[PDB]
Amino acid sequence: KNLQAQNFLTATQWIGVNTQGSSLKNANYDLRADPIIPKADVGPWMMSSVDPNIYQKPL
Amino acid sequence: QSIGGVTPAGVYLYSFALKPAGRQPSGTCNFSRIDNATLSLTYKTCSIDATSPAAVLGNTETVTANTATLLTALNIYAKNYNVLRIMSGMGGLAYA
Amino acid sequence: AGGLSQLVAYGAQDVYLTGNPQITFFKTVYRRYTNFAIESIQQTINGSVGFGNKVSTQISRNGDLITDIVVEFVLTKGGNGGTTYYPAEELLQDVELEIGGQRIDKHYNDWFRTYDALFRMNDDRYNYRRMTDWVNNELVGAQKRFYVPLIFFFNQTPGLALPLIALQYHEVKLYFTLASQVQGVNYNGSSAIAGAAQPTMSVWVDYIFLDTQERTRFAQLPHEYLIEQLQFTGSETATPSATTQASQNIRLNFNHPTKYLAWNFNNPTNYGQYTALANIPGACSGAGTAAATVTTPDYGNTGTYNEQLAVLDSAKIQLNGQDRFATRKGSYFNKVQPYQSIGGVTPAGVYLYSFALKPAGRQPSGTCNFSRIDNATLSLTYKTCSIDATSPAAVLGNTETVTANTATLLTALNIYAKNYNVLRIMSGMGGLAYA
Amino acid sequence: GGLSQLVAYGAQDVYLTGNPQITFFKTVYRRYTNFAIESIQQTINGSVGFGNKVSTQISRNGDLITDIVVEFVLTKGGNGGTTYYPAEELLQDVELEIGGQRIDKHYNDWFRTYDALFRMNDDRYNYRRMTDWVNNELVGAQKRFYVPLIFFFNQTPGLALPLIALQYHEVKLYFTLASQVQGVNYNGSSAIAGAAQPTMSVWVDYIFLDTQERTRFAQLPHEYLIEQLQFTGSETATPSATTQASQNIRLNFNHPTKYLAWNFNNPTNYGQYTALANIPGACSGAGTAAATVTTPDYGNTGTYNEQLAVLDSAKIQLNGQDRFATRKGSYFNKVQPYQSIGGVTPAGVYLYSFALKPAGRQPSGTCNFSRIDNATLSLTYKTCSIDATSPAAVLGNTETVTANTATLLTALNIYAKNYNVLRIMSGMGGLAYAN
Amino acid sequence: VGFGNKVSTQISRNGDLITDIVVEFVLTKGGNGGTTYYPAEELLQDVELEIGGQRIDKHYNDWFRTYDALFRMNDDRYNYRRMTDWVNNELVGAQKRFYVPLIFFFNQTPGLALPLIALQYHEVKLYFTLASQVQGVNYNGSSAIA
Amino acid sequence: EIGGQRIDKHYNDWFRTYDALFRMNDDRYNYRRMTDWVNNELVGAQKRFYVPLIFFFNQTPGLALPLIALQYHEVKLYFTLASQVQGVNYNGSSAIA
Amino acid sequence: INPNGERDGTGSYVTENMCSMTLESQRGLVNRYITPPGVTGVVQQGGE
């Protein structure tokens, strides 16, 4: 039959994974890849969540 | 023989069961084991002038109304047994 | 809320209905049964079919057990609607059941009428009428096939089906007597109807075909069946009159455990007439108009519930001189007895007294064994025949103890007794335990 | 032939005939204790007549008792069409007492309601024949009526009251006769000059047991599951011609209840459960110029036309919680009895069953009202805006309206039938539960 | 809901077993007494019983008439007629609530009450086809009733 | 209805009684704006009304129904619409054609 | 009162039979009537 009221539901693979995130607020527009620098939170105040935006498929 | 009520003219019954009106099986004809089952019907002569009561009310066994030819449809029904199986919270018939 | 609120409202007074429950109503388990089939076979009628003739048939060895018997007749109307009354029933004057050359039972046209009057009802009775009469205002020359079912013990239930294959040396026969006259078919009152056709007759028997194991058991095993028989004699009815309440003591020549007695008074001229004729609607030919004549019934309405036309005032049954019950009025035997024990509605002029809780059922439910009574007597008091039947004021405004002057025409008395006996079948032969 | 059916055996038949358990061709009848039934007249203490109240003590003239019939002899105070079940109307009520304790009680209206719901077909017609004049009898006509009692022991042998086991308690029936009976001593509000007083007789059918059963009944304790009637008469919110009257009735009932039943009526006219109207049968002279919608056609007081019924809708509520969804009055008049009884119920008479088969003896489901703190019946009436004297309005109207004459249906009778235990021991007995 | 339409219902889990099913209809008279014949029965052209998507059974308006003709009787039959027709000489414009009992196996006996409680994983539905025309209600023979 | 059990039931009159008694100030006014015409609208005017329900779970998140914890029980709302509404399809006892 | 798990419920067709049907249907058989070899344009007939 079935297993009802006690099943491992879907957590994040329901609406689909986010292939964008916050990686496009300060996105790159040039065709060439950009020099990637890590996040490395150095600010006591005024941080960000820019998400590095590493070009996985370069020119 | 089989029910005990009164059936109106034009409606017919043939039982394969001692008491077809009940729930409990009392003899059945299993048509899943019969290839060619046929109902053979002979009709009455439609020669009575229906607009003349004498023609109708005073006529013979095998003769009916000219208006009887309007009874062009035949509905044949049969009632059988099957088994409804329920388990695992689901169910359906034993025979498809 | 809803039904659940009822279930939870449980306490001490529920214990006697639902505590330690034994059953449910929601889980029917059906019984598995032996395999069998039912087939209709036409029998050969020996002798010559016609009015007044005697014919017979041997029930053919076309099955293992037999039940229903239906006698078909093709009759025509010798007059218009209203001139016939259950003519197929009237025609089958009698039927005798013979096994191994000996009598088992015998029914009469009048018995069929009496039986019906007491035991059939509602739409069964109507459908029955449809199989023996013309009930749709048919006219002269009309032709219909009638079906007269028989009511021998094996014709009422498969439980008493007769194991014909067990009777290796004995045949089962039906002897039939056809009436010399049938009202509205070949005679109209006392007159013959010129040109009337002779009946066409056919006898049908329903055979039970059993599977192998069951067939073997029936052929090999001895059997006993508790079956019904009808005892019957005709008597002269004491004649009542305008000047008197006739009385009569009829010694009952009966035997065996009897479920019930049944009787009627009648006019031999008019089949089914158990009541007086009168000029009130349905009570005579032409009733309600100038032609109303209280010498002939409205045949199509021969039977009636109008007690005032009944002839019996009161009655009692004595056993060896001891009243078996306190005297009751004729209307008690007509209306109440069947109310309490049958549940149908009995026509005036037909009476029943039961010794059984269920006179209509198969299962014995108390019987009077007449074989142990030296002098059983039916004591009848008749109504005074003083009412002028041609005057509705007199016919309808009268008293309990009187009836129509025309009630004196009900000169015949038919007394029946329904008893049990034991059918015995062994070593290829039929049988009856008691005489 | 039938052989062609027997050979047609497959896997699907295993459920019906495999490993067979039963046959249909071998009825086994159960041997039973020998017994006999005797009909014995009881004496009556006190004169009978209109407005009289009398009683009987059931004589010790048998071991067990069942059927009881009260006979009356009435004379018509007018012509056919002036009476309606007058013997039923006359017997205002019957009270059953054992050892000085009330066991049960029936009312004339209950007999009418009971009949309207539970009797049927020819059982009902034969019943009517035992309580009324149904063959167009005329003024002065004399007739003996037979009105049966319907106490638990009067319906089945299974509940025969063991008088022999009640050696130290008297068993009595108190019978109240109506002050007036329509068409017999009164015609609407007027008395009928010269009307005769009724003759009365009470008959009890006694069971005579054989030696061993008599001893057991006399010595052993017994518990008989019995039915009891509960009845509360009350004010009906007077129906209105301008709006929908409504009413909340306290269902002051107790015990496991098989069913509730009720009707609305006009107390002036016995059996009137519907409005009067100028349509054939719906009022005195209905259909013609002389018609009045102030008086019923007494002989046709009852009707199946719910257009003349007052109830629009109803629900039963227990402890402030609906027991079922609100249904229309026609649901309680026609569907309920279709489902639960199988007969036809006259307009104005309603049923709500808690049982699968309320018409039977087996307690096939019950509602325990002795476990409810606040039981109530909520009724809504139709708008009584239809001009009763105009067939076009009477017959062409809507589902939610009725006759203006429906405002006369101001009395409501609510009945309940429940199950209790009548315990007999050491010669004495009474009910197991007071409430 | 309307003439000629196909409608359905799903049976709610408001109890454990089910038996009787009655379909209530309200019809009006499009002509005088004598113009209709069991019109609520005619209206229910057909009905189907389905469990988990499997048709268990089906009845037709004609079947209801045939069934009745053979198996109902006496006052059972009359009361039935009262719940499906106009039998008290009602006139044109009359409105009436009719009750059509169904005749599926579980609608005839408690012995076969459908165990909805045991069908926790399957839906149970009824389908009903309403007639395009009902005599004396929306059409007099072939003539539409305005 | 939850699990087939009747949990609660409200009536048009309750909505009116409840509002009349428990809502207030601009909560009541804004509430009226969602159920009536309050800007002197004229015949033929069409508006969408929003009638919030007032069951316990419709008043606080604290009693939100855990449909997630009721995987085997469905939750239903059964509604009845009035046969007549004043100033919409009827004017007192008269119908508005 | 009553569970309702008919939402996530499979159809009833999963619980059928497919082998307790009607008769065996002896209509579909093999073809075992091979026509004569004869002659044709390729294999012409021999001389008289």
Identify the helix (H) or strand (E) that includes residue A4: none
Does chain F reach chain E with at least 3 CB pairs under 8 Å? yes
Q: SS3 for D372-423, per residue?
A: CCCEEEEEEECEEEECCCCHHHHHCCCCCEEEHHHHHCCEEEEEEEEEEEEE
The span from the CA of D209 to the CA of D433, in Å, is: 30
* C-chain residue closest to E109, CA distance: C26
Backbone conformation region of residue C349, classed left if phi is above 0, alpha if psi is from -120 to 50, else beta = left
Q: Tell whether C4 is within 8 A of chain F (Cβ).
A: yes
Terminal Cα-to-Cα distance of chain A (whole angstroms): 54
- B93 sits in which H/E element: strand B90-93
CA distance B43 to B62: 8
Q: Does B1 touch chain C (CB under 8 A)?
A: yes
User: Could you tell me if C147 and C130 are in contact, meaning their C-beta atoms sit under 8 angstroms apart?
Assistant: no
Among residues C352, C331, C349, C380, which one has the least CA distance to residue D73? C331
Q: How far apart are CA C151 and CA C108, in angstroms?
A: 11
Establish how many alpha carbons lie within 13 A of residue C277's alpha carbon, considering only the half-sphere containing its beta carbon. 22
Total residue length of chain C: 435
The kind and range of the H/E element at C322 are: strand C322-323
Contact A28, A55 (CB under 8 A): yes
Q: Hey, which residues 34-63 in chain E have their CB within 8 Å of chain D?
A: none
Interchain CB contacts (distance < 8 Å): F and G? 15
Question: How far is it, in rounded angstroms, from Cα D120 to Cα D107?
Answer: 20
Contacts of G15 in chain E (CB under 8 A): 52
Chains that touch B (3 or more CB pairs under 8 A): A, C, D, E, G
Q: Which residues contact D86 (CB under 8 A, 6 or more apart)?
A: D74, D131, D132, D133, D145, D181, D182, D183, D184
B vs D: CB pairs below 8 A:
32
The conformation of residue F20, written as its DSSP 8-state character, comes to: H
- Pairing between strand D327-328 and D190-191? unpaired
| D344 interface with E at CB cutoff 8 Å | yes
Instruction: Please check whether residue D302 is in contact with residue D346, taking contact to mean a CB–CB distance below 8 angstroms.
Output: yes
Probe site for chain D from E17, E73, E76 (most D CB atoms < 10 A)? E76
| F4 interfaces chain E, CB cutoff of 8 Å | yes
Chain A, nearest residue to G4 by Cα: A4
CB contact under 8 A, E88 and D307: yes
Say if the Cβ atoms of G2 and F74 lie within 8 Å: no
Q: What are phi and psi of A3, to 5 degrees?
A: -115, 105
Q: Hey, what amino acid is at D409?
A: L
D16 close contact with B: CB closer than 8 A: yes
In angstroms, the CA C16 to CA C8 distance is 16
Distances (CA, A) of A5 to A8, B87, D266: 10, 19, 59
Identify which of F61, F51, F71 has the alpha carbon closest to the alpha carbon of residue F10: F51
Cα–Cα distance for residue pair E113/F52, rounded to 1 Å: 40
In C184-297, the DSSP E strands lie at 187-188, 191-192, 200-210, 223-236, 247-251, 257-266
Name the residue type at position D329: G
- Compute φ and ψ for D224, nearest 5 degrees: -105, 125
Q: Which helix (H) or strand (E) holds D96?
A: strand D91-98
Burial state string for C20-43 with b = 16 or more CB within 10 A and e = fewer than 16: eeeeebbeeeeebbbbbbbbebeb
Which method was used? cryo-EM
Q: What is the DSSP string of D126-186?
A: HHHHTTS--S---TT-EEEEEEE--SGGGT-GGG-B-GGG-TTS-EEEEEEE-S--BTTTE
- Cα gap C80→C141, rounded to integer Å: 8
CB contact (8 A) between residue E109 and residue C27: no
* CA distances from residue C339 to C43, C122, C220, D12 in whole angstroms, order as listed: 39, 13, 44, 45
Please identify which residue in the block is written with the tokens 């329904």.
Answer: C418
The residues, ordered by sequence, that sit 6+ positions from C135 with a Cβ below 8 Å of its Cβ are C129
Nearest to C267 by CA among C415, C383, C93, C410: C410
Spatial distance between the Cα atoms of C172 and C431, rounded to a whole number of angstroms: 11
Three-state SS across C324-375? CCCCEEHHHHHHHHHHHHCCCCCCCCEEEEECCCCCCCCCCCCCEEHHHCCC
Neighbours of B71 (CB within 10 A): 12
- List the single residue in C10, C34, C328 with the smallest CB-CB distance to D39: C328
Q: From the CA of E112, how many Å to the nearest CA of chain C?
A: 6
Please answer whether residues C133 and C86 qualify as being in contact, where contact means their C-beta atoms are separated by less than 8 angstroms.
yes
Give the angle D326-D330-D335 at the CA atoms, nearest 5°: 90
Place of tokens 């005017």: F45
* DSSP track, D218-273: HHS-EEEEEEEEEEEEEEPPPP-SSS--EEEEE----SEEEEEEEEEE-TTSTT--
Tokens representing D184? 């017999």
C75 CA to chain B: closest CA distance, Å? Answer: 10
Where residue C222 falls (left for φ over 0; alpha for ψ -120 to 50; beta otherwise) is beta
Query: Which structure tokens are listed for C87?
Result: 């003519």
Contact present, D432 and D373 (Cβ < 8 Å): no
Rounded CA-CA distance E50/C235 in Å is 66
Task: Establish whether chain F is in contact with chain B, requiring a minimum of 3 CB pairs below 8 angstroms.
Answer: no
Mark yes or no for CB contact C136/B57 under 8 Å: yes
| CA neighbor of G13 nearest in space, from E104, E125, E55, E119 | E55
DSSP reduced 3-state for D80: coil
- Containing H/E element for E51? strand E44-51
Residue D140 pairs in a beta bridge with none
Which chain C residue lies closest to B1 (C-alpha atoms)?
C68
Q: Which of D11, C37, D22, D4 is nearest to B17 (CA)?
A: C37
Flag whether residue F71 sits within 8 Å of chain A, measured between CB atoms: yes
Q: Which residues of D touch E110 (CB under 8 A)?
A: 356
Cβ contact E117–G4 (<8 Å): no
Q: Choose, out of E19, E85, E97, the residue to mutate when testing the contact with D (most D CBs < 10 Å).
A: E97
| Distance separating alpha carbons of residues E141 and E135, to the nearest angstrom | 6
Q: Indicate yes or no: CB of C30 within 8 angstroms of CB of B25.
A: yes
HSE, side-chain direction, 13 A CA sphere, residue E109: 14
Query: Does G15 contact B89 at a Cβ distance shorter than 8 Å?
Result: no
Residues 6+ apart with CB under 8 A from A10: none
Rounded CA separation F90/D316 (Å) = 32
By the 8 A CB rule, do D112 and D85 touch? yes
User: If you write DSSP's letter for every residue of D102-129 in order, what string do you get?
Assistant: EEEEEEHHHHHHHHHHH--HHHHHHHHH
- 8 Å CB contact of C26 and E113: yes
Give the DSSP letter string of C156-200: T-GGG-B-GGG-TT--EEEEEEE-S--BTTTEETTEE-TTPPPPE
What residues of chain E lie within 8 A of the CB of A2, using their CB? 121
Compute the distance between CA of residue C161 and CA of residue E54 in angstroms, rounded to an integer.
42
Specify whether the CB–CB gap between C186 and C196 falls below 8 A: yes
**Cβ of B94 and G18 within 8 Å?**
no
Whether the CB-CB separation of D221 and D425 falls below 8 Å is answered with yes
Chains in contact with D, where contact means 3 or more Cβ–Cβ distances below 8 Å, are B, C, E
Note whether G12 and B82 are within 8 A (CB). no
Query: What is the least distance, in Å, from the CA of C335 to any CA of chain D?
Result: 7
Residue type for position B75: N
Nearest CA in chain A to G11: A1
Collapsed DSSP state (helix, strand, coil) of residue C204: strand
Helix (H) or strand (E) holding D4: helix D3-6
Closest CA relative to residue D150, chosen from D126, D127, D170, D125:
D127
Distances C166 to C42, C159, C214, C222, D404 between C-alpha atoms, Å? 21, 16, 12, 8, 73
CA distances in angstroms from D168 to D104, D161, D224, E114, listed in the order given: 19, 14, 18, 52
Helices and strands in chain A: count of H runs, count of E runs: 0, 0
Question: What does residue C279 show for φ and ψ, rounded to 5 degrees?
Answer: -80, 55
For residue D282, the SS3 value is coil
CA distance E37 to chain B (A): 14
> What is the SS3 assignment for C212?
helix
Q: Do chain A and chain C touch with ≥3 beta carbon pairs under 8 Å? A: no
Q: Is E97 on the interface with B (CB under 8 A)?
A: no
Closest CA to B39 of B13, B61, B63, B65: B13
Q: Do C141 and B58 touch (CB under 8 A)?
A: yes
Query: How many Cβ contacts (< 8 angstroms) between chains E and G?
Result: 46
CA-CA distance, D155 to D111, in Å (whole number)? 14
- Which of C2, C26, C28 is facing E17, going by the closest CB pair? C26
Largest CA distance in chain A: 57
Cβ–Cβ under 8 Å, residues E111 and B78: no
Task: Give one word for E143, left, alpha or beta, with left for phi > 0 and alpha for psi -120 to 50.
Answer: beta
Q: Give the up-direction half-sphere exposure of residue D289: CA atoms within 13 A in the CB hemisphere.
A: 0
G1 to chain F: which residues are within 8 Å by CB?
A: 3-5
- Cα distances from F97 to residues A38, C230, D98, D415, F42, in angstroms, run 74, 77, 69, 46, 16
Give dist(CA D350, CA D337) in Å, integer.
9
Per the structure block, which two tokens stand in for D100?
A: 């000085």
CA-nearest residue to C4 within chain E is: E15
Using the Cβ of D210 and the Cβ atoms of chain C, whether some distance falls under 8 Å is answered with no
Query: E119, E124, E125: best mutation site toward chain G, by most G Cβ within 10 Å?
Result: E119
Half-sphere exposure of D274 (CA within 13 A, CB side): 34
CA angle E140, E141, E146 (to 5 degrees): 35
d(CA D340, CA E101) in angstroms, rounded, equals 13
DSSP-based three-state secondary structure for B30: coil
Which residues, in sequence order, are bridge partners of residue D48? none
Q: Which tokens go with D53? A: 């109240």
- Copy the structure tokens of residue F90: 């009827």
Contact C90/C271 with Cβ under 8 angstroms?
A: yes
Neighbour subunits, G (≥3 Cβ pairs < 8 A): A, B, E, F
G1-to-B12, E45, F77, F79 alpha-carbon distances in Å: 45, 34, 18, 22
Q: What is the dihedral of CA E40, E41, E46, E49, to 10 degrees?
A: 90
Residue whose pair of structure tokens reads 């008269």 in the numeric block: F94
CA nearest neighbour of C276 among C306, C251, C250, C254: C306
**Which of C363, C394, C387, C67 is closest to C208 using CA atoms?**
C67
Which residues, in sequence order, are bridge partners of residue C209?
A: C37
Question: Which residues does chain F have within 8 Å of residue A10's beta carbon, measured at their own beta carbons?
Answer: none
| Chain E CB within 8 Å of residue A20 CB | no
In whole angstroms, give the CA distance from residue G2 to residue D169.
Answer: 51
**F66 — contact with chain A (CB < 8 Å)?**
no
CB contact under 8 A, E115 and B4: no
Asked whether the beta carbons of residue G1 and residue E16 sit closer than 8 angstroms, the reply is yes
Nearest residue on chain E to C126, alpha-carbon basis: E74
Contacts of G8 in chain A (CB under 8 A): 2, 4
HEC string of G1-48 equals CCCCCCCCCCCHHHHCCCCCCCCCCCCCCCCCCCCCCCCCCCCCCCCC
Cβ D397 vs Cβ D406: under 8 Å = no
